[PDB]
A paper describes a structure:
Glutathione transferases (GSTs) are a superfamily of proteins found in all cellular organisms, which usually exist as multiple isoforms. One general function of this superfamily is the involvement in detoxication reactions for both endogenous and xenobiotic compounds. In insects, the Delta and Epsilon class GSTs make major contributions to detoxication of insecticides, contributing to insecticide resistance. We report a new Epsilon class protein crystal structure from Drosophila melanogaster for the glutathione transferase DmGSTE6.
In the present study, we have determined the structure of DmGSTE6 to supplement the currently known Epsilon structures. This structure adopts the typically highly conserved GST fold with two domains comprising a βαβαββα motif in the N-terminus and an all α-helical domain in the C-terminus. The Epsilon clasp motif comprises an extended ‘wafer’ arrangement of four histidines (two contributed from each subunit), which is supported by interactions with several conserved serines from helices 3, 4 and 6. His101 from one subunit wraps around the His101 from the other subunit to generate the clasp motif also seen in the Delta GST class. These His–His interactions are also supported by three serines, Ser68, Ser104, Ser163, in each subunit. Furthermore, Ser68 directly interacts with GSH in the active site as the Ser68 OG and N atoms are within 2.5–3.3 Å of the GSH O11 and O12 atoms. The His69 ND1 atom is also within the interaction distance of 3.5 Å of the GSH O12 atom. From superposition the residues for DmGSTE6 that would generate a hydrophobic binding cavity for HNE appear to be Ser12 (catalytic residue); Pro11, Pro13, Pro14 (N-terminus helix 1); Ile36 (coil between beta strand 2 and helix 2); Phe108, Ile112, Arg113, Leu120 (helix 4); Phe174 (C-terminus helix 7); Leu209, Phe213 (helix 9).
Author numbering:
A (entry chain C): 3 to 222
B (entry chain A): 2 to 222
């Protein structure tokens, strides 16, 4: 019995939706209205004291942080270790990419802007935040050099994690696929998964539209 | 020997790896990478780590980077038991949440946000936002320690090494009020009892604090 707490525009929530779909697991999806600060309710804080989404409930146990969740799901429920290989050297690449996503991409790239634009209602965003997004594209383009997937030669949860956030960066800076052909090819490859549209595609488009509506701009 | 660690003592994620190597009693070569001299940007270093960060670990022709990936690798490959990184999916999920909390909320948003501005871009005035972020980190860690002696449960794990390397470093920006944060104070004190703590984490924390003291940076009101 799985319950996922979150909302479709959220990148880390979509990373979990991709993993759940890839593992063909059934779950209840509970909406959490972040703009209304519904995550700050006493009832949600009891589930996740960091008051973030996603939170996964698995038969009474609460797990949070999307990367911890999707590793947990694969380790516990997958038929094989395909999505999260147990071989320590292969796992070390996956883990590096996941922690890259946690810090460099999401915390420094996305939440840094979401906080000032959506949470604080500010229209102007410091130029450093633009520079941070270009740095992310540059790194991811390098990470994809000579391989079809982000962490090696097979689909893993690192792909789910990073595609959920890297595709979201379009909300701030459109991806130039002439400058970034590897990133373009990799998103296109992942878009072919039958569950991609419902798990990640539509939420990306929603987030992009949310930020379009704010009319935010980068400071020079 | 077979293991090489690339890094430098003031760096919190390098110290996370030094703590783990010490706890596992592994021998290794320590190679200094002077990030102040931008030595991590040499083409030679980029071949080992294209993200040009420290730490990097070299193990028999393989390069691993990101401190959290490195220390999970070390325990899984070399430890006698999974004590420091339990394999039980549920216990593992708590450790993993704490590690990723360190990557994003603590290091990226808390420390590197200020370090880049102050150490490498020479800014002396830091926005109040960055002070508030450190206080929120202290608030979260205090909550995480509720009812237990360690950060991810009832036993020492790599989550303790990761988070103490960075949380102890926060003194460089905001001194820790142990009357407001008695659990954090006790937890740091408990880890300081580890005989390998002084060399692995303690010296470098003090170095980092002294580096920031010298810059004379302040937070805006
Ligand atoms: N790295 C974390 C990010 C979690 C996170 O910050 N989620 C955002 C939504 S995208 C959130 O919960 N914001 C509300 C809050 O922190 O109060 C993860 O992968 O779960
Ligand atoms: N979260 C990463 C942080 C790595 C990191 O950013 N290290 C800093 C030093 S504390 C660095 O290498 N700065 C040089 C650079 O990024 O070029 C980890 O745990 O390894």
């Amino acid at each position: 019995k799985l319950t996922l707490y979150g909302l479709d525009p959220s990148p880390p929530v979509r990373a979990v939706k991709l993993t759940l779909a890839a593992l063909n697991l059934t779950y209840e999806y509970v909406n959490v209205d972040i703009v209304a600060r519904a995550q700050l309710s006493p009832e949600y804080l009891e589930k996740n004291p960091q008051h973030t989404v996603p939170t996964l409930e698995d038969d009474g146990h609460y797990i949070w942080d999307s990367h911890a969740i999707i590793a947990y799901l694969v380790s516990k429920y997958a038929d094989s270790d395909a999505l999260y290989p147990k071989d320590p050297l292969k796992r070390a690449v996956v883990d590096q990419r996941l922690h890259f996503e946690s810090g460099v991409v999401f915390a420094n790239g996305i939440r840094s802007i979401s906080k000032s634009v959506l949470f604080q209602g500010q229209t102007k965003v410091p130029k450093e935040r633009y520079d941070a997004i270009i740095e992310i594209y540059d790194f991811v383009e390098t990470f994809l050099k000579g391989q079809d997937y982000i962490a090696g030669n097979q689909l893993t949860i690192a792909d789910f994690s990073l595609v959920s956030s890297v595709a979201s960066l379009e909300a701030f800076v459109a991806l130039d696929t002439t400058k970034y052909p590897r990133i373009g090819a990799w998103i296109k490859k992942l878009e072919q998964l039958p569950y991609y549209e419902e798990a990640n595609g539509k939420g990306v488009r929603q987030l992009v539209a949310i930020f379009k509506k704010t009319n935010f701009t980068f400071e020079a």
